[model samples]
Target chain A: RELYFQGMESVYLFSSGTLKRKANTICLETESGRKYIPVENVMDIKVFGEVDLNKRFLEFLSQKRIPIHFFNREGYYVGTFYPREYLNSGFLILKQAEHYINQEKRMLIAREIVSRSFQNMVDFLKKRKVRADSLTRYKKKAEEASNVSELMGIEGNAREEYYSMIDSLVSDERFRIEKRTRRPPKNFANTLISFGNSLLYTTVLSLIYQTHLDPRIGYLHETNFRRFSLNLDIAELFKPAVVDRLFLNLVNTRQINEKHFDEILMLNDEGKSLFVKNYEQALRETVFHKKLNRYVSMRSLIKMELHKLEKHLIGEQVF
Target chain B: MESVYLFSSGTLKRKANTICLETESGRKYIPVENVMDIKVFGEVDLNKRFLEFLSQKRIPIHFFNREGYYVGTFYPREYLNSGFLILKQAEHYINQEKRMLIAREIVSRSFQNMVDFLKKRKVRADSLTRYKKKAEEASNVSELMGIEGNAREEYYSMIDSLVSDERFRIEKRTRRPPKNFANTLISFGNSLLYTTVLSLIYQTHLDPRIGYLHETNFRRFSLNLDIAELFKPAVVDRLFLNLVNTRQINEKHFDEISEGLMLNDEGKSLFVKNYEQALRETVVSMRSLIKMELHKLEKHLIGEQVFGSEE
Candidate 1:
């Protein structure tokens, strides 16, 4: 799979068997007359079939900040073409109001999202560690943690000790843990974690952009007034649950590995492709449980998280 | 005998034996003994008599330009002058090796203080981490600055994700109209340094017009700027942090007008008052040394010793 950026206006997605252009404005050619492109109306365009477009249509989209995504045969995300949206001011206002009305309320919701996400991560980690034998006891300890802080502490210690015992389980010298630092991870597992975080940041940003809130005014995270604070606050709870779980599933199930990435995955083009592929697939996968008695797509879950934030902002419930 | 008077405002007044400052709309009264240093943010008329009074009482007065930029300080002559230490400071300023040696000491001590504070918070930073080792290994001031940067970045990322907010993005550090609030605090800190140094210079017999570390070229103040660098982390940073945590100075204090978000007059007044209070609060002696003790020690060094003793 491959993704191409055509200037700042649109992106192109290509796979082994097909090529597609996911765009906002589609011109319908009828026998009666010519119809104009939809403006300030369309939200998202999901293309599953192959399609072609002329230069005029692409020009119309350049003026609008609309993102169109392409999906594969199995409904996995291939890539997207996103445009700039300037009429997004109204939504930003409401979003800000939702977060700023109360700090404790906002933090409670934020905590809930993060805690749920971390819990999902522990479950994923437990499944992976079951084969390693070292993660089982840590999993039990994690399950026993009563609070988020305790859970986080247990998770950190478990990961550290898990890395120490990795030699016995995986036996891949290239994947051995050394020390974690800023510059890209040295092994496959760490790389997945990093990639997951990137996706989480982007996803959270998109959600924030859609709201009327200024992405900078946040609760839970200190308002440093430098970067987007709210997004970081929201991502904290979701990243572990959403991204980390997806990553563990992909890696342990052998769906993605070293072969799936390029040697220069650190470089711009290759890195983006790797990220987009993983992000799209992760969004498509469904999680099942007896309680819900149904399957929930990761994309829907992310949207649900955003809705929870919305409800929290409106003072619907405590969290 | 001359007596020192405290005024709420950073203004000079005269009386026969006691000084008086009428607390009014624009004036704040701060007792001289209660004050560690005086920071002048506005253009105020002063005379030789007022200068003599401050000098006699050994009060340092620092001044700032309209834009909150630092101007200079008025450091008085030390009652207990150490000629040898002054000579060493000048020698170090002229010689790159000696200057670097002193700079490294200052930077290393500041970093240690910062790390100790973080450790007390129980933020499980891998005690044996490579970054900690690198910080310990930093040889020069510049190297220590680099190490501090790296350590801070790692520490920031390691903070509980619960505390993480997408609204604040840590990017490349830039000066002037700082890209983030933290950077803005840093810039404000530089402004505090100027004011503190200016106050110090006022108490000195050595002309505030002449100085070391910072150049005495076109600029009237350099020595104050130099001294401010030593005190900022303890004074300004701590005050800023407290102001932020207490919800006293947040986004609400700033107005997003046509000129972009800025501190309104009310916010400025509140901040200035708190800053003055922070300076005035006295430190109590502790069995084991405390952070506030260092501030008192620095004050004593500037007031009595002129120059600090090198360890």
Candidate 2:
């Protein structure tokens, strides 16, 4: 409600609190104290604690079209309260669905996603002077894969090989992820990867909401009864660059350690805050874009991929 | 696809690609492919995995409290999309004259159908003649709502006169813990119809927020409530009355909670079975009738004349 508006930022509530409206102001009342946020200066909200909110507050956010994502105690993503789509383009939605239902159209995009994702993994390994012949082999197979299942198998094999080398890349001995595990990751390294991937998935989901493309319609992943699979598809291309790079840097640099994790190896609140702070900084970091012939933030790159997908669906680009 | 009702308290989970409900007694598996929706009436513990599976199956899970009042629904992500129709819906809603015309049509059709229903049963509905006239003369939406509300009050009294059993008589309409046997049935039936309309709306391209009669707001849904009005007298009322008249529902079916009476589990099953049957077996199936009503609104939104002149 402030007239002197600042740049919008994503507010992360990592402490247990009750979020309520107090006299036209949105306030988070925690044990520490009350913190007021200007509604116009909020891009979205990320809740990682035992936060309590009522319908009246939700209605206020819905009017503002703000999405709120929730995470469980174990850092597992629960769900998102995505407000009604104010930017729904029914024509684009139909076109996206059409692309999915058409096998040739779908396979073409699926192969591209798998090929590019594997290419990124290969590039990451190569930059560290690590041999990735097996990953390179699968990347070729991915380009020629006839169906989604075959493509997924090729991608899985390449990912397994990529993960096998993570132990060598990281200098820390405790960061060894002998095997990838999920649900309740067995080691600190796997836990961080799982947590970071979850964050990336939701980040892509929020970006998809800004476009005409429906997140429910996906190419590499099938569109079904699931809440969203397109975000899962899109997250793959960025995970190696966004999540894997950040965690490796954090662990090797010893900025995050065993003290930041619990006995079950879940990231504690302190570790989460550290990761989130660096994650925000990473998203803001820019790199040269070959197509636009200019530098763009990592977040903007994700948005551009969606724009590319939209162009492919509308026959403006071959993708 | 069919609706599954869970009445026994249990833990539900995704067990080997199918949903399994484990109670104190035993575990039962329900095939996900055959399930259209689930209605939970008992205490059920489910994890995020179960919810994710249901979302994959495109199945909505509706929850009800101990009092049989509909609490909420976990609707899966929407698959349908049509911005053109939504804009047309918004266009009609924003225009006052157009919005009032549709509202008047809804109220008039509802009362007209109620009168015909009463006349067929040989009940005196002369009490509603003036209200029907007033509905036509109404200048605004609120005035029309008042006419419709007063007409329904008289209409319920007429229904009481038509019921043969004095035990199931509606002396007055009450909710939020309905006071009498008939009031409980009416309240339960209305809740069922509201959810039923909402489910149907989900299947269409229509956004259930932009309603003509019921003003759309920040609330979750209002179009369903408006659409339910067109079907309440025909579907819920007719089925519940027939159930009582046939003695399929009786005094034994209700449990008195202090001052209010509510349908027990068996009673709910009985009513839902017949209600589902009624939706299927009508001359022009009740499901299709409601769907047709939605289609008519769709046509009207595109600037086609529908419900022309008067009823």
Candidate 3:
């Protein structure tokens, strides 16, 4: 058990399969699945298909504190099946609600998220030799908003300016994303953006599960009417750095071309796998976790961010 | 969910949707999600309102006497109540052969663990290997019990070899007040082990009263004693030897009488503190490990999983 804590690890399951427990192992029965991983080695799992799982397998997974994630055929992440968290604290939930209720504390967290989003936007646009005048101006006003609604308005304006800079971020005009759009993306870059954003959103949600904070609450994002909003507030922390950068790199490198997404505009089953392969590659790149005094993956960075938010919510720190 | 232990005397009250512990020193607001049960070791004031709230959450509070021994639970309605599991337990109990089969396995594992523990410590532990075999050969629970008794007798004869300290040598495994230093330590250790395992069984859907090796009627928690044997030699005994050998617990704390010895309050506290630390060192939490075994036993009864060493 002590050894298991030393290396926090996760598994990637992108193929269709039935996950079942056999003796001391968990077997994945894919069409051509060739492996079995001892249940001892897994901490997290990502499933891209309609994987059939039994109660026995789920029971064993909970005994080991493993969380499983799901993604759609378009590589847009759907949701997670999280086990009961024994470390859950009701005090932390109350504290989170307290922070969200108080205008000053609520604005404090909102401003931090907006500030980080603008700085990353500035960094992304400056790299492409594009101007972000309104983004900087909205970022300045983001701190001056006395109430949460005004603060939210400032954040929306900053995001608008950030989205405007996207046209110049990618070099190809055929794949230019003139505006923000949704499902059944009309162009290649739009498809990439939507898929990439979904990946980040689900990634952030998965990180939230590792924390004691309630994932239903958010100060910056609209928690009402949305199925989940905590991830929206946090997705801003990584959308430009990880998702947009991956899109730009893939486009510039011509690894995935305009013609590749010209038809259907949405990723087909085969193309989804190829896109996810690249997404997983960029998601897992490692960086130093200073608090850990060791290296951790970008996947773990999402976990690290939630840990900070949990500490902030629990009054261990100010956001 | 985790168990909360309240040692200091306190008044428990409802704090909105939560529970609060108000002691002489301070007040603590306890989270509903963080607790599955509460163990009280000192005086506690609780009212109907607090208990009503606890029942709604299904978190029971267990009481211990002043001497720090489990009395009984203010047991709430079991949250994991399952008619299927209860039916399965009854099915296994009604069959004579099935009962004997599980009974033999329990004692056999205990003896096997006894021999393995001694052998690992570089002692003449294999002496019980013959006795362990005799347990399997025995046709019934009575015969199994006799063989287990003999195996433990031989196992105890070698207990002295593990101890280098003269004051802590085991003459025999005496009980009640425990006739010697080693016996006193063993007795307290066993009692603590018994109640700890009892708390774990409460966490599961299993009824502690329906047990095998130990008679079911003598104590409602006979299953704890049965499972306790499997762990005692491997875990508790080794820790006792380490305590004596290192003088972590020594003559200064012992209250030896003409017939038996007793530990002072300080000694009891020290022993109690190390009980959990040693369990973690030996393996996983006693609660979870025991739960896994219960899980295996459930699967066995359901005919889906094989359990025990012979299988």
Winning model by DockQ: 2
Can you tell me which runs of candidate 2 are displaced by over 4 Å?
A1-319, B304-311
Candidate 3 per-residue lDDT, tens place, B1-311, comes to: 56566666677788988888888999987788867667666666654345556766867665554444344444443345443454345445545677787777788778778877888887776578788777767777878878887788788788787677765787766755566678777777776666566656767766565577765442234677777888887557877887787788877777654455776555666776776576555335655676677777767766766555444
The lowest-lDDT stretch of 10 consecutive residues in candidate 1 chain A is A12-21
The candidate that wins on lDDT is 2
Name the DockQ score for candidate 2.
0.05
Which segments of model 3 are wrong by more than 4 Å? A1-319, B1-4, B10-33, B48-62, B255-260, B282-286, B308-311
Q: Which candidate leads in TM-score?
A: 2
* TM-score of structure candidate 2: 0.56
User: lDDT rank, highest first?
Assistant: 2, 3, 1
Backbone clashes, candidate 2: 2
Count of backbone clashes, every candidate in sequence: 58, 2, 0
Model 1 over residues A1-319: C-alpha lDDT tens digits?
A: 5976332222222322212123553543334643333544654444444434322333344345344454444443333332322222122323343344445444455456445544554565566563445555756765565444554455556555544543333344454344434464666766766767777776776555444334555554544323556676667655645665555456555556567565554324554566567677777778774566889876666666666666555556636
Q: B61-94 in candidate 2: lDDT tens per residue?
A: 7667667876655555555645345545665676
Record all residue pairs in model 3 with backbone atoms less than 3 Å apart, i.e. clashing: none
Each model's TM-score for chain A is 0.53, 0.71, 0.68
